[model samples]
Target: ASKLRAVLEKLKLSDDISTAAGMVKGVVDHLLLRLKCDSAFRGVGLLNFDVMFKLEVPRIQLEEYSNTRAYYFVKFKRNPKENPLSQFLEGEILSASKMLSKFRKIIKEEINIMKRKRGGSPAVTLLIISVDITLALESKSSWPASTQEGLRIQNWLSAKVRKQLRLKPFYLVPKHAKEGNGFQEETWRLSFSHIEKEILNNHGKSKTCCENKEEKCCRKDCLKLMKYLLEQLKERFKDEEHLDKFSSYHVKTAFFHVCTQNPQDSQWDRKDLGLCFDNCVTYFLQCLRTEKLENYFIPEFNLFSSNLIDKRSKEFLTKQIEYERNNEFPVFDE
Candidate 1:
């Protein structure tokens, strides 16, 4: 029962996120519908709400995504490029309309109105942006054509990834511009997290690789161990070197990029778990030293930015790895 009390704290804290998520979901649905009739919101459709809520409303201590938060997507009638609200690094980012925050100001207004109407409403943080379903679904998704393993992964389930394509719409989240003069509420970050999920789910080269008794592969297991160590180091130097922005997600993204290159089942044997993880560790360390980890799906988006992680933080993590690598990751207990 010593540690069980901590478990209770975990359970109790879970309520906040759940209640928060529920209230967030409720408010988003309400405001989303109202925006449909609003004049400024015309020419777009929130028709994607059901898919957005169900597929996008992610709960994960598994991959461990958001906390007490909900994600949303808005679908446009035509190419997002036509208006350019959609852009990050060459169409990978989204820009909110900051007609002096008129659009978002209205969103803020409606949310405030709801706060008065409903007591169950969670304290608000509404992020809004739109996606071009047609242009986004274009054959630029033709990524697999260039990579051997990527092509194989796609060929393994050409139909499967495409199915996810329709399922996962792009999202625009609130973010401030780094270079611009002031708080550019108009600048937003585009998300393809849904695709990240599907790819990680379909991580194996062969579908049956992780299936049966002896057939299980080491890729995921290797990733799990690496992530465990990553989480451990985070707690260690944590505030000392300021490792907050860097997390397991960085390792995960790097792992995905590596898998695209080492894209074969035989290349990652279960018996070779040590070597497999070693390769991933080396790859991860290299990316950190270089301070560049591309969002696996979107080449232009770098994870090693001031918005994400920075140079000092980058060097610190590699030093942690250098310690752990030669010492057999002493943090992992027997």
Candidate 2:
């Protein structure tokens, strides 16, 4: 009963979760429609929404399972001609505020719609915490493609916007920015979520995995387990002052590394769930210890930096790993 309960909480995508996701998608859809009709947004389109489930374990005691949360991914349209790398680096494109304001306006409209429909504000409020405008640019075909200059321009832009909006959780990130030696100068793109999404979706479909079914995929099962661990860590460290830096993205990156290194479908099978789960933890340990994990698509983009993890945090994570190894990951309850 205990193990079954854990599995149910970890894997179940309840109707409430679906409803929350639908509300988020609705707002995003309205925003996308508004953008598409605008003359300025001619080059953009609402790509798609990617739905992901996250298990919330509110306490280490593992007595009860908090409801799962849904995170919706909405990629904005990218103009083929924009060439974000050159445009941002050269300072040719000015403020993206024109594009960003559309998100703000739509959110406001959503609130108004709810107010009118209910004759009062709805009990459930969906806040637009942050929107990331991550971009991907094609590599230039000439020498001195000027990657460094682009990095500088991105930093300048990040700083400028950081001061302008000064809004919590609202960030305009040029995915690839100049950092330490670990961040490679080449192969940096503004955004790689699209690629990440494609990789995840295509993993089992193309026959590398035995049968291409969700239940049979090793990668996904391991990812789900890892994400659950990440959520546990969030609650475990919720009171810690530096909890923001550690996120599920790091765990996802670890999974990506695992996927690329092990492309054979045979490697990720339902039968080897324990092995796969352990393997993922092993890679996560590597990242936590070294404070460096490469982005799956862009090797130069390090998921964890030195500043993001301190020695104490590393020790804490090491202990957590030990706990999982010993207890068979009680948070997963399996």
Candidate 3:
């Protein structure tokens, strides 16, 4: 009975399971999306999410079939270039309206390809950015925004392509949207592979926020997986070891950046480096996930207050049934 009680706690999850699940699922989705886009660039080690901005909304309508939930939605709005509206913003990274005319052609072609390839696949094309605009300052906060949207989109697409081996993204293009003469869209396509290329290719002004150097000779610094560790360490270590001294979160993020998204010829091969990603990454991710939940949800439940969390734990058998019901897969189109 005692052993069973311990197992029950593990399975019942936290009282704030909904919040924890959504947040972690968001991160998992980001990682998987990065993997998909990386493969798209054909093993290019360069890519990063720099061309994203955040807009907090009270709520977003996610499903047409159901009522809108009150959960917050973070919008990936575009910063398009010079126009009458652009003048109001003074100095923002704006894309030209002319790009939208070109974007219609590009998106239309890709949509037709998807139709031919996956006729029955249920998908929607939301407009992404389409503007000829010079990038101004790229912010780090945009990373999380792009990461979230990218992951959700990836999950939807992955479900569609699971039954067949498809080229994936080349078939599905995001539409070019015009909202009151400005581009309304998701985040721009900035992947780690693209970032890696710029760092290794030239020492000119980098578009990424992570780029710290100002010269060509400094470009190589962006290539290192443990660049953060380099900041922490003053002296160079003889052996280049994996996870030797960095924290799990930084180490995991760096590993994910290198192993899954390196540019085609970026020279960050895992086989050559003799490191296994799943083993190293999973260990770190699990720890990080646990820490994240603990930090958010205070463990200050009153033992004698007789709340749902404690009550639910005592009624393990009934809770199991509830858990099973919560975990059911959606019904097939019947």
Candidate 4:
């Protein structure tokens, strides 16, 4: 029991973490609701947060994980016939710059209200963390659309939003955003919040690794362990920004691929967790070597294409691969 407890402790996060996260969500949801009620913001209607409440028994470290923070998957309900994308394209919407100008007004209004209790002095209690806006553009059967208009909008919007919001917006394209994926398409800054939540909920239904209910699920366990290992690697390469290239997203992508390829629960038996870890590492290295890790859902969307990962980072990954291959994961050492 002592050994089991120790292993569990390493995997544990804060005890009342969800309670803290809910408070943050409540505050943000209220703000978004208030924004919608005002006639001045009718362009974007009925803003809401999609909250994922299902919790897994064994938690996996995600790129978005924060001990003291929460992420709200935000969406707006406007006429289906018109959205921010259509509005911008038709020249009816605020230009990327103008949008931030308006958004900043809201920020200042909220910030000042919190500052009132501080006797007109600024307080760090209320702050803007990060915001990412994903744009969906149409693509053809032969290839994904690299729409110049979309890119131009994103380029300028990124600058303005980052300046005001303190974090750069993320753009994404999803596989089914348009239609069937039999042919290729690109989705920039694809928001996987809802889909990812659903995936977890479904995959977590099984009580055991196999039909006999004899073993635990090694698939999720391996993913959790790998995420932890990557954190250690981040510390090792802390000074090198390029090394941030290897994120928990990449690990997640590989896990998705592995699960698709080997759908049998028996393959992920608890006793074979070490093997599962090695398999994930092998896939991750393949992606690094080729510079073409497909977004598991969208084959055309390559996660590695945005930047040229430095040679030293690649070399370090190779070293890490060797270490994992030999089962020398010091990060989990007891």
- The top-ranked prediction according to lDDT is 1
Clashes of each: 2, 2, 20, 8
Between which residue pairs do clashes occur in model 2?
Answer: 135-191, 208-265
For residues 1-334, write the lDDT of model 4, one tens digit per residue.
2332345466785446577667667665565565555444433322121221111111111121121111111122334453433332212222322332344356456642322221111111343332222122211111112211121112322334323322212222222112233311211133334434434434433433234556556666667766776777788769966566677777777777766655566666666666766777787777777677666434655666633356667667767766756655655566
lDDT of each: 0.51, 0.46, 0.27, 0.45
lDDT of 1 by residue, 130-149 (tens): 11111111112222211212
Model 3 lDDT-worst window of ten: 63-72
TM per candidate: 0.56, 0.60, 0.21, 0.59
Winner on lDDT between 1 and 2 is: 1
lDDT of 1: 0.51
Question: What is the per-residue lDDT of model 3 for residues 23-95, given as tens digits with 9 covering 90 to 100?
Answer: 5445334433443342121121211312221112112112111111111112222353322223212133222
Candidate 3's C-alpha runs over 4 A off are 1-102, 106-112, 115-192, 197-279, 282-284, 291-334
| Candidate 4 least-lDDT 10 residues | 64-73
Give the better candidate number (1 or 4) by TM-score.
4
